[PDB]
């Protein structure tokens, strides 16, 4: 519960920034917070999806975008589900499919 929220809550403005902490997120130990309650856990895979988007999707994270999508709930799409619905394919337009 401290391994979970303190990392998307760490991520949310570093993504908006261009700080080095994407490779720090590579070498981070807390990349798994161990069943992070399907809300932070669900969006977490998106938050690491846009990491390899700006660091050059090589079809690695379209499964973690897809996985972030399928772990997302039934509430409304306008929250973030628009942007995973857009960005999820944005990286597969990068592939060609």
């Amino acid at each position: 519960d401290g391994q979970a929220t303190l990392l998307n809550l760490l991520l949310r403005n570093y993504l908006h920034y261009s700080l080095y902490d994407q490779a720090e997120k590579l070498v981070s130990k807390s990349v798994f917070p161990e069943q992070a309650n399907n809300n932070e856990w669900a969006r977490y895979l998106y938050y690491t999806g846009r990491i390899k988007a700006i660091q050059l999707e090589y079809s690695e994270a379209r499964r973690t975008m897809t996985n972030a999508l399928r772990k997302a709930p039934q509430h409304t799409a306008v929250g973030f589900k628009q942007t995973v619905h857009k960005l999820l394919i944005v990286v597969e337009l990068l592939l060609g499919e």
Binding site: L19, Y20, D21, E24
Partner: peptide, 8 residues
């Protein structure tokens, strides 16, 4: 802050 930087 750059503890994150010089970490690896």
């Amino acid at each position: 802050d750059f503890w994150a930087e010089i970490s690896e």
